[PDB]
Design an enzyme around this catalytic site. Structure first.
Site, short mmCIF file in Angstrom:
data_model
loop_
_atom_site.label_atom_id
_atom_site.label_comp_id
_atom_site.label_asym_id
_atom_site.label_seq_id
_atom_site.Cartn_x
_atom_site.Cartn_y
_atom_site.Cartn_z
N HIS A 476 0.79 -1.21 0.00
CA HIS A 476 0.00 0.00 0.00
C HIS A 476 0.84 1.28 0.00
O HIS A 476 0.94 1.95 -1.03
CB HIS A 476 -0.94 -0.02 1.22
CG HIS A 476 -2.01 1.01 1.17
ND1 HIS A 476 -2.97 1.13 2.15
CD2 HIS A 476 -2.27 1.99 0.26
CE1 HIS A 476 -3.77 2.14 1.85
NE2 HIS A 476 -3.37 2.67 0.71
N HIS A 481 1.07 5.00 -2.90
CA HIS A 481 1.29 6.36 -2.43
C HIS A 481 2.67 6.97 -2.70
O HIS A 481 2.80 8.02 -3.35
CB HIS A 481 1.05 6.41 -0.92
CG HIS A 481 -0.38 6.22 -0.54
ND1 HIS A 481 -1.24 7.27 -0.28
CD2 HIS A 481 -1.12 5.09 -0.41
CE1 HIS A 481 -2.44 6.79 0.00
NE2 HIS A 481 -2.39 5.47 -0.07
N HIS A 667 -3.97 0.22 -6.53
CA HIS A 667 -4.28 0.85 -5.26
C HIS A 667 -5.67 0.46 -4.76
O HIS A 667 -5.84 0.21 -3.57
CB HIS A 667 -4.19 2.38 -5.39
CG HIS A 667 -4.64 3.11 -4.16
ND1 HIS A 667 -5.89 3.67 -4.04
CD2 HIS A 667 -4.02 3.29 -2.97
CE1 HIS A 667 -6.03 4.18 -2.83
NE2 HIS A 667 -4.91 3.96 -2.15
N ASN A 671 -6.40 -1.36 -1.22
CA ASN A 671 -6.93 -0.40 -0.26
C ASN A 671 -8.38 -0.60 0.21
O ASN A 671 -8.63 -0.60 1.41
CB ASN A 671 -6.83 1.03 -0.82
CG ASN A 671 -7.33 2.06 0.19
OD1 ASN A 671 -6.68 2.27 1.20
ND2 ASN A 671 -8.50 2.64 -0.06
N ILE A 816 -7.05 8.31 -1.28
CA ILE A 816 -7.28 8.10 0.14
C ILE A 816 -6.34 6.97 0.57
O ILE A 816 -6.05 6.85 1.78
CB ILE A 816 -8.78 7.73 0.42
CG1 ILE A 816 -9.05 7.79 1.92
CG2 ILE A 816 -9.12 6.36 -0.18
CD1 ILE A 816 -8.64 9.13 2.53
#
Ligand SMILES: [Fe+3]
Length: 816
Positions: A476, A481, A667, A671, A816
């Site tokens: 993650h 990110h 993602h 997520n 997010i």
């Protein structure tokens, strides 16, 4: 005169005061140039009045009429300047000339705050060589404005994109215990770069950036929201700064039991709830975003939502079937690997960690009647291998109070029925002459009864603590990110808003720099949420730097990843060019469909702007963009031979395809199942606090007499559990203003009908894919891996979703 319409949103949203001499616009010609070759500029023109004609508008938007003194002799307008004379900033949506459209979506602060006047371009798309001559210099000057000069403290209204290392996580000025290694810029700690903030050095350490109340992001990266409940990114800050302390007081005052005493105490959280001090409830209940996380009686109760994983069976998570199934359809479905030899080997130094030979014996495994050679040859043996990944950190982690882990390895067998079954777990510890600890490595095999069943359940917990840590920090945080941010920065620094590749990629960056900055401040900072809720504590983020040493851009492509992990083989006779070795591998099977749709879209888009490989090599913006993304953004790995060169149409397609994949589907898959699977702490423990007990000790007797307590004393304690459940609940929620794959925030992002038609086909294809995935979940033959004993249909790669904690939907970006 040219009739125009300006649409803007007053700050209070995310009227007569805008009239008078408050806002002026100046058209710029794309065809008629001055004596220097620059498009001629019109007179300052102010808003004339409020347009209340069109029914279409909504979103707290307001339209203003304006007429420009512009005759055919000035040419055709291709851009415009705007100056805001009001004290307060407003959000400029668009300008429409009657048709010439301008999509702005940018905050315009008071004119005195800007070094140069804000400039916006019409929605036409141009590679550099196609830029109308009168706009060429304006185009380059705007990019130079966006790059800044690499110095200075960035301010709220700045729109300067630049790079810096992760030297802003420690807080040495507050305590040397909060000092942290700088991540990035060294061979010891390589790491993707992040957005430069320039706050300056701490008092005690010139290499660490001082603390700040607000971590800057270029202004338009900070997404405003019409509904406060949609500002999900502010949740972690409130959670760390306000909610966490409130929870801690309830425990310090002994107003609630410090530890869970049975599995039912955990289930109670989403049933009757947990009773907390009035002042604690009052501290939490009024906060935006945080208040949406729990139901309450407004007095003493907080109730978390029922996690999807227990919605049908609250006990199914403890089955071996579900443990293995989540490795291919769970929150972290991308670590399992094929095992082609036995026993499994290690590349770590035995001189440092002791003999690294596996202790798992082939004869002890139940492979449903298959011999080891048969299992290996039929490609039915797999493994979840955290042995080499964790071993280097086990000693330092175990030295911490309340943290104890093993470097685990789980062997899986693919049964004839197509489901995976766990057959052994190796719990390894490093050994060095002179160790004070008498604990040793051990192998645990499946068991359904007696103390043996409890030891096997704990072995699964040690494995999932390793997995949860790797999932949160690597699958993650690192892979989505952190790895994506450098590309966002490079794109704004080198690809003009007019650039086709800028238009292709930017929707996939929405809110990424914003959530990352908020993460550096409250999620991955010293004593932040992750450090205080996950096993590695202060070693958490640096572990991700060690893993980054092995990060390979081209291996992020789904086919390459499946092949690298030995879960698929190349096979041209198949639709996707790869044959899965676990045929009903939900993440991979659904992922290949999404991957193919994105590929078709990129392959159809690129040719509209680049006819041949030479056109890609000669795009100065594109070449500068890529050179910088690699040499600066991911500069610590610039020495690697696997980076695409970007001199062909093929390479351009590849690079864009991988970037879009990582930002959207990858993602989403790692997520949005966070709370659905991890909302029951027993299913996804974030930490382990003790090793297996020695026989003849009370701890051992406890495993026999109170297995649930033995388990709970081993995993994440109740207080950090409350904090981590809250954070993953936020992370698993879709804001109502999300923009999903196949969608764009504006139907006029480009004037090119060809590009627009191609995008429409892409969205139609995604709807087609969703129907197919629905058929897969409804296919009884696939129930074993797509639903499991938890009866939870794998919907994480369904393209669409409504708002909320839905366990489905693929956003365009890491939002997010
Ligand atoms: Fe995320």
């Amino acid at each position: 005169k040219i009739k125009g319409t300006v649409v803007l949103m007053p700050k209070n949203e995310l009227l007569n005061a805008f009239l008078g001499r408050s806002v002026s616009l100046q058209l710029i010609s794309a065809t008629k140039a001055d004596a220097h070759g620059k498009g001629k500029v019109g007179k300052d023109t102010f808003l004339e009045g409020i347009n209340t004609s069109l029914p279409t508008l909504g979103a707290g938007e307001s339209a203003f009429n304006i007429h420009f003194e512009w005759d055919g002799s000035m040419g055709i307008p291709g851009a415009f300047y705007i100056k805001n004379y009001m004290q307060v900033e407003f959000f400029l949506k668009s300008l429409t000339l009657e048709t010439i459209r301008f999509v702005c979506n940018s905050w315009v602060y008071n004119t005195k705050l800007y070094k140069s006047v804000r400039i916006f371009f019409a929605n036409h798309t141009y590679v550099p060589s196609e830029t109308p001559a009168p706009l060429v210099s304006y185009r380059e000057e705007e990019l130079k404005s966006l790059r800044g000069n690499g110095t200075g403290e960035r301010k709220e209204y700045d729109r300067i994109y630049d790079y810096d290392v992760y030297n802003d996580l420690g807080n040495p000025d507050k305590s040397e215990k909060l000092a942290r290694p700088v991540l990035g810029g060294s061979s010891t700690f390589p790491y993707p770069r992040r957005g430069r903030t320039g706050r300056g050095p701490t008092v005690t350490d010139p290499n660490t950036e001082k603390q700040g109340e607000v971590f800057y992001v270029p202004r338009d990266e900070n997404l405003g929201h019409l509904k406060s409940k949609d500002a999900l990114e502010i949740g972690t800050k409130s959670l760390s700064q306000i909610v966490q302390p409130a929870f801690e007081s309830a425990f310090d005052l002994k107003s609630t039991p410090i530890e869970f005493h049975s599995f039912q105490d955990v289930h109670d959280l989403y049933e009757g709830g947990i009773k907390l001090p009035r002042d604690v409830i009052s501290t939490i209940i009024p906060l935006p975003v945080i208040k949406e996380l729990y139901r309450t009686d407004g007095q003493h109760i907080l109730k978390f939502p029922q996690p999807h994983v227990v919605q049908v069976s609250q006990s199914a998570w403890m089955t071996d079937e579900e443990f293995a199934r989540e490795m291919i359809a769970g929150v972290n479905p991308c670590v399992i690997r094929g095992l082609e030899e036995f026993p499994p080997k290690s590349n770590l130094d035995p001189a440092i960690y002791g003999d690294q030979s596996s202790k798992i014996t082939a004869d002890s495994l139940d492979l449903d009647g298959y011999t080891m050679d048969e299992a290996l040859g039929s490609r039915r043996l797999f493994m979840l291998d955290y042995h080499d990944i964790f071993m280097p950190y086990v000693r330092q982690i175990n030295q911490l109070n309340s943290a104890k882990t093993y470097a685990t390895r789980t062997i899986l067998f693919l049964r004839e029925d197509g489901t995976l079954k766990p057959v052994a777990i190796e719990l390894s510890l490093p050994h060095s002459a002179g160790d004070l600890s008498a604990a040793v490595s051990q192998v645990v095999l499946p068991a359904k009864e007696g103390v043996e069943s409890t030891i096997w359940l704990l072995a699964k917990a040690y494995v999932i603590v390793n997995d949860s840590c790797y999932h949160q920090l690597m699958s993650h945080w690192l892979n989505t990110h952190a790895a994506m941010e450098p590309f966002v920065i490079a794109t704004h620094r080198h690809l003009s808003v007019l650039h086709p590749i800028y238009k292709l990629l930017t929707p996939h960056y929405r809110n990424n720099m914003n959530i990352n900055a908020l993460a550096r401040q409250s999620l991955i900072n010293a004593n932040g949420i992750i450090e205080t809720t996950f096993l590695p504590s202060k070693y958490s983020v640096e572990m991700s730097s060690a893993v980054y040493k092995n990060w390979v851009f081209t291996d992020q492509a789904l086919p390459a990843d499946l092949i690298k992990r030995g879960v698929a083989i190349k096979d041209p006779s198949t639709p996707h060019g790869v044959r899965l070795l676990i045929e009903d591998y939900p993440y991979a099977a659904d992922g290949l469909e999404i991957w193919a749709a994105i590929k078709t879209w990129v392959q159809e888009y690129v040719p509209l702007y680049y006819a041949r490989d030479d056109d890609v090599k000669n795009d100065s913006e594109l070449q500068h963009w890529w050179k910088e993304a690699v040499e600066k953004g991911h500069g610590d790995l610039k020495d690697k031979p696997w980076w695409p060169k970007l001199q062909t149409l093929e390479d351009l397609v590849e690079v864009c395809l991988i970037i879009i994949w990582i930002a959207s589907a990858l993602h989403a898959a790692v997520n949005f199942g966070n709370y659905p699977y991890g909302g029951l702490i027993m299913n996804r423990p974030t930490a382990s606090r003790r090793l297996l007990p020695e026989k003849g000790t009370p701890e051992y007797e406890e495993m026999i007499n109170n297995h649930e307590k033995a388990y709970l004393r081993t995993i994440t304690s109740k207080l950090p559990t409350l904090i981590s459940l809250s954070v993953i609940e936020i992370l698993s929620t879709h804001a109502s203003d999300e923009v999903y794959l196949g969608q764009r925030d504006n139907p006029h992002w480009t004037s090119d009908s060809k590009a627009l038609q191609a995008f429409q086909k892409f969205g139609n294809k995604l709807k087609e894919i969703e129907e197919k995935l629905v058929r897969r979940n409804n296919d009884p033959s696939l129930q074993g891996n797509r639903l499991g004993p938890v009866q939870l249909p794998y919907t994480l790669l369904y393209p669409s979703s409504e708002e909320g904690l839905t366990f489905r939907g693929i956003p365009n970006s890491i939002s997010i």
